[PDB]
Symmetry: D2
Subunit: 249 residues, 4 copies
């Protein structure tokens, strides 16, 4: 008798057992969901990580930069869940920015080819995934993506912050399309998770604190959006950040 | 096996069976919550309405402008739920603005005594309720208030919009205090719902105020990617129950929009 | 050949020569404006401005002062003349609502007084003065970014959230007269009151909390922030009073060194 | 005695005399600024347009997708304004999105190559221009870019709206770098401007309703034919009168974004 009992949910973005997607998948299975997982490049490695989950789930390859992977995705999901069955949820937990665009590298030294790759994977793909999967989603369905509050600039995050600002915009347009299918589209803006000064300021600002080593409160928030309990929320952002973004000091 | 099984929750703001609080109370009871209800002024009338809920719940009087009611509230709640027991949730579903501060009356013609009364009830009382109830709340607890997105000005709502802007600010300060108890504080920003006063304004009780409200409501369902039904409070009640649950444990001082996604779209 | 040459502007809120309104008035006069001042002992401070200006009494909690204001201004500027600008630089919150006092311990009578003066009066002033304002005119109020909660500011932060909402409604009314209404959100300024807190008037704990809040502003601001200098704020107000932001109304301009745009 | 007397300002983005940049250049010259103009591809056509400005100004070629044009830009500007002189202002008034990403085409049918080109020109180039020009900018200087409020989704604008969301984020990072030079960076978010039945009946009606809603929402109204209030706002940011504003957005939209109805 779980929160997601009988729901068929696709979860992308598992690479390690510290991945936010790994925790989303674990909580969803604990809550009765039947999962379909997608992984990128290191599929044998990802399959071994998926063996750590409480229940067995099919693993499909999905490189969001590969248009053939996207064109075949719905058919491959249908084969995994069975003909006549549709998805109730989709989790986009994919992000990438080359070292030139995120870290110590000066903001101005990131070449556009690197930034474009990062934007393709971190923002445009949220629209690609919705385009591929909306034709196989049930009404009352839910699409959830992962965000990192980009409303204010900050050190090091640089072009990944720019990619998240683009993602938030993409999410609002995806909600317009998803609405035609009776499907919601939302992002969960998480605080920093270990998957230093800027990061420690989070626990200080958060009225309920913030534990960077614990992805479970973020996974629970994603599951709340996948459930039938936020039925009037779409094109929106839910902050699972300890309330840090609501406080200056 | 409900979403709020075994939770003790205080729900304020029931006046009619169209009240958002009535629907919050109904959904919470359907989901296994044990309620304590608070009502203002028309207690015999409220008791007749609360009899329509799926389960019996104690009804306590609470006028948020009454210091004595606030000073005795925690003790009265403890008597209702039993000594040694504490609340897991609190719902503030209280709002008021005199006629001078809403509708057709010009924005500039609202006297400050009327505006102040509206702000006391609609915004300051969210802090009063939290002050009175945090000492009797369990860790992991949740305080939820009702909001109407005041980020942009709109016709007729006038000083009620101003009161909601103040409420959003109060919520962020309440979260700082509630955090000390391991309690979350958040607001649910709902789209327009046909409750007692909303139906009267739409019916013109001035022509202009109702016509502007009519265009505002029509636009809401148009802008909402999933549509918006003003006659249905259940999606709003479900959203409040999600915040009262253990499923949004890292959200505080925040606003969740249960508005069909209308605020995310220009047209 | 100043930015505000020939403009007739009302400036409220001068109490000391450290008042933001004192600097706004000074810069406006330097830029060719003809002022009318309102105060609520102030004449000796207003005499320190570069040019002579009539001083009118205005207690924003006094309905009679508000009812007579337009008539008194017309008498000061001469029959047939109207105002081009209005500056609201008024704010108040009792000690129970801001400072060391717990957020929960502020009685509503104190909060309501603070909201009356700091937020509602922006609407009162616009109601009184719009009938004597020229098209292309400008109303400007002072704000302190209340988007996120912070220590000590407490109910003054709540009053500013209310003021931002009031400004958006005032813009609707002012638009009917071809008048703009905007707020300038300033970073913290070392006014007579603020310098005392730094010195230790609030005590060790809150004095350190406020110092972190202040050091953080200059750190976050890409161009830095000088709390001892009100001139960048006065210049921003004058930009809004000018003809150079003709399509901005119901809005907030941040004169805060860009601090509100940065997390760290 | 003008608002920008003696200031040396670079203005990019003139293509026609309806371009917002044409109006920014005109107002800045009326206010005493000495300009350097940059144009893309159709330079002869651009020269004919810039002949219509009140004063003569050097025109430099700048394709923001061309790394060689960006690498040589500072040197070429220095040659135009004279050695030992620096810029006081920079105006980025550049935008592009292919027809697959903006207009009638479904949001989902825009290929990434088209979206990426649009993002390169409309958002990333704001950072490229700042990188090239900050070494030749004076303290107290100002960089201004053009925005269209992307806080809420809307019909047709689609991936251009996404590019503007990216641009607003880029501006906040550019402000961090510009601050090291004592230079401000800000965007002006304009209401819709009629620059240079084409969309059909359905799309044409939705775009007209979207565009007309601005004048209705704006407390002071909005004139879609007139770029001058937008040009004046840009010049206010280029002036010394907003010295404490950076990484920010000034709305020159009649106040439409502050009203729901
Ligand atoms: N870690 C944090 O502090 C934090 C904070 C807020 C939000 N987020 C977001 O959460 C999401 C998950 O990140 P994470 O922290 O779990 O990191 P992660 O490294 O564990 O996950 C990122 C995933 O993206 C996948 N990916 C990269 N390129 C891909 C491609 N071409 N096709 C498909 N998938 C591809 C990777 O294989 C990986 O599984 C991201 O969107 C991230 O930005 C993370
Ligand atoms: N109806 C809408 O369109 C709408 C939209 C968004 C949010 N909301 C908010 O939802 C909440 C509930 O409103 P509703 O629409 O159900 O209307 P309602 O009239 O049914 O409920 C308002 C409640 O406030 C109570 N109240 C007033 N003065 C009080 C006092 N002094 N002490 C205690 N309680 C007092 C009333 O007795 C009533 O129970 C309010 O905060 C309202 O602003 C309503
Ligand atoms: N750090 C700061 O000082 C700071 C930061 C941002 C914004 N602001 C705002 O700037 C404005 C000016 O404040 P300041 O810092 O110059 O302080 P101040 O004390 O010099 O000015 C406040 C003024 O309000 C006046 N006032 C109070 N009650 C009044 C009443 N009933 N009627 C009329 N006037 C009344 C006082 O007489 C005084 O002139 C306020 O709105 C304030 O909130 C200040
Ligand atoms: N027109 C409106 O309704 C509106 C509204 C808000 C903001 N804006 C913005 O204002 C700016 C100017 O747009 P406009 O309306 O004047 O249109 P426009 O077509 O006249 O100007 C766009 C300019 O971008 C230039 N450009 C395109 N590709 C380029 C490249 N590779 N290198 C260099 N420059 C390149 C073009 O040559 C042209 O001069 C843009 O940023 C636009 O998004 C326009
Ligand atoms: C090859 C290489 C690349 C990098 C830079 N970043 C990533 O690879 C990278 C990892 C991720 C996961 S997405 C993400 N998103 C946020 C908001 C924070 C974090 C830590 N990861 O994205 N990009 C550094 C060193 N070596
Ligand atoms: C004669 C008369 C008096 C009033 C006074 N206001 C209320 O009763 C009142 C009721 C409520 C419920 S709270 C609320 N909140 C929003 C956002 C909208 C509405 C209509 N009500 O607020 N004010 C109104 C109409 N006609
Ligand atoms: C020592 C002490 C005294 C008070 C009484 N209020 C003021 O002095 C007062 C002055 C003002 C001017 S408005 C203002 N606004 C901001 C945002 C900051 C400051 C310092 N003053 O308002 N209230 C309150 C707290 N602590
Ligand atoms: C028929 C058609 C053609 C295109 C090709 N792009 C442009 O003409 C073009 C011109 C511009 C200038 S930037 C701009 N920015 C905004 C916010 C609005 C407009 C109309 N142009 O950008 N792309 C696109 C859409 N529909």
């Amino acid at each position: 008798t779980g929160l997601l009992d009988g729901k068929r949910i696709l979860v992308s973005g598992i690479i390690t057992d510290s991945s936010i997607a790994f925790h989303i998948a674990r909580v969803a299975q604990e809550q009765g969901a039947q999962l379909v997982l997608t992984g990128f490049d290191r599929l044998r490695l990802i399959q071994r990580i998926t063996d750590r989950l409480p229940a067995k789930a099919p693993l499909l390859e999905l490189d969001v930069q590969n248009e053939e992977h996207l064109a075949s995705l719905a058919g491959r999901v249908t084969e995994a869940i069975g003909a006549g069955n549709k998805l109730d949820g989709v989790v986009h937990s994919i992000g990438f920015m080359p070292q030139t665009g995120m870290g110590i590298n000066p903001f101005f030294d990131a070449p556009y080819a690197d930034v474009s790759k990062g934007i393709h994977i971190s923002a445009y793909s949220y629209a690609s995934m919705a385009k591929a999967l909306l034709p196989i989603m049930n009404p009352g369905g839910s699409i959830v993506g992962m965000d990192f509050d980009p409303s204010r600039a900050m050190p090091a995050y640089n072009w990944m912050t720019v990619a998240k600002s683009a993602l938030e915009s993409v999410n609002r347009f995806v909600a317009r399309e998803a609405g035609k299918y009776g499907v919601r589209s939302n992002l969960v803006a998480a605080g920093p998770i270990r998957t230093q000064l800027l990061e420690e300021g989070w626990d200080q600002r958060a009225p309920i604190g913030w534990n960077m080593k614990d992805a479970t409160p973020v996974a629970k928030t994603v599951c709340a959006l996948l459930s039938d309990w936020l039925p009037a929320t779409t094109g929106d952002i839910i902050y699972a950040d300890g309330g840090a973004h609501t406080q200056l000091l």
